[PDB]
């Protein structure tokens, strides 16, 4: 890498990242074609700005298309790039796409624990509790250990919705991981058991 190439990449990546943060996926596409005209090869961080720009404007199809451009260019997506797509999929309730992206990160040899934690919280936040339980249990049964904050989140939200079957499954997996249930978790299960008519 010469000094002239480094100088151009700085001003090209300055313009590109100032439009990704501006939530302008169209502008981020123009700069990439400016890089191609100059002969500069867009790296993983240039397509990251394209994914983020689409992701910030709630655009799941364009962000997935941007990922295909990155893969089609032979570049390796950053771990943060996949997390932006995983978090976007959860916000739209697309658990199937969120799980497909997690499989890609495992294929890319990344660490999917943090991205799996993000996917479950997005589904819970966006009132997709049924989808969140499916994703959470698959990760928990797969061997991943969730955060204590997320364990308390999943148990409590299921019991507020009257879903004792999922809340009991999670609490069993929580102890199998090595986190013992406390009075808080039992009080969540009892909130549903007390209404079943069988004392």
């Amino acid at each position: 890498v010469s000094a002239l190439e480094r100088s151009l990449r700085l001003t090209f990546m300055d313009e590109l990242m100032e439009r990704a943060r501006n939530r302008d996926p169209s502008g981020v596409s123009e700069v990439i074609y400016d890089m191609i005209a100059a002969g500069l090869s867009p790296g993983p961080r240039s397509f990251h700005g394209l994914v983020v720009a689409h992701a910030l404007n709630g655009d799941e199809q364009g962000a997935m298309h941007s990922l295909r451009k990155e893969l089609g260019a032979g570049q390796r997506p950053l771990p943060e790039t996949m997390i932006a797509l995983v978090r976007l999929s959860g916000s739209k309730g697309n658990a199937q796409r969120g799980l497909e992206l997690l499989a890609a990160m495992e294929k890319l040899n990344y660490d999917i624990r943090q991205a799996w934690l993000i996917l479950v919280e997005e589904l819970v936040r966006t009132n997709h509790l049924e989808e969140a339980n499916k994703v959470f249990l698959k990760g928990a049964r797969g061997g991943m250990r969730a955060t204590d904050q997320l364990y308390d989140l999943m148990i409590e939200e299921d019991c507020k919705a009257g879903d004792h079957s999922n809340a009991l499954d999670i609490s069993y997996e929580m102890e199998a991981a090595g986190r013992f249930a406390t009075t808080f978790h039992f009080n969540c299960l009892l909130s549903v058991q007390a209404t079943c008519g069988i004392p």
Partner: protein, 385 residues
Amino acid sequence: METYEGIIFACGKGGLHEDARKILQYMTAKDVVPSSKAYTGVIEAFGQAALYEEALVAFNTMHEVGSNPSIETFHSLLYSFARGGLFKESEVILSRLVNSGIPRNRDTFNATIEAYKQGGKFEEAVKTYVDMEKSRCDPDERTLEAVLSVYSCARLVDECREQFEEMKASDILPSIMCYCMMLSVYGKTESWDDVNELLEEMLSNRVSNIHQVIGQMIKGNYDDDSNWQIVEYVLDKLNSEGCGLGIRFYNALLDALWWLGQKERAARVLNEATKRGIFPELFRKNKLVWSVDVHRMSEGGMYTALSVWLNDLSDILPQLAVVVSVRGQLEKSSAARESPITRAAFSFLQDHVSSSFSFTGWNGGRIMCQRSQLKQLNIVALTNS
């Protein structure tokens, strides 16, 4: 399925990639899996606009949705690559067609000749035409036009005569594209006797209207305000077979005009093509890059494009002024800087702006001029002989 495929074919025909992308997104947003033919129309549109990255994404997405490419899909790529001279990517399709069980038809051979020609591989272009006849087949009219362009490009006056006269030996009435290539090879060798001999043939042309008008306008008879409407009338009629035929017509026409000394007329002909959508990648003018893309143009068309681009540069600052002569996988190699287009553009730039445009150390097919050197810069004379 019938309405989606019908519209996308029109977008691919006319090279409206933006509309094609929205139809694809509309289908996906309605949980509709587009057919293998629908994607081929989208792939066609991107190749019309020289958007190879977006074309190969659609080709990749065909296998993702199970809409495996048909024989027509491998032709949309070949013609898209042929215009850009991407014979490296053309051989990938050819090496894939033999493995996919698809025999080489005539259309595959035409793209191979066109790709090698635009890529500067003259020896390999005629070899394909040599190997084509061994495999029997039946060369069509475009195949004769495909091989005539090879001989016309490498200044073969006697070979071009034999090829051209044999075209009318079967009473075929060769199209205006072949006539413009005759004028180039005669104009390159300064054979002014043969130029006037062919022009009189195009001046009468009681059967074909396009030859008459185009032949008349080359000599300068139709360069009036009211007399340029007839020339535009022919251009609008030809602007109905899509961008695929248009790019071939304007490449030959600009090549003929430049070698005949009608360099100012070539400037206005190129200005007529751009407003009709021909050469959509030709110019970019933003704060970052001022670029001219000539990898899909003929030598005469490239000189006209550079001449206008240089003159417009002196009128006005971007971070870089670039000339895109090679646009493909050949860039990341030393062969791109040895391409005939790259050498011709650099040689043209050397004796017009002195040593202001130098090669790039990171790309073989680029000719750059830094912002600092743009300060130390009509520049090109555009006159009719």
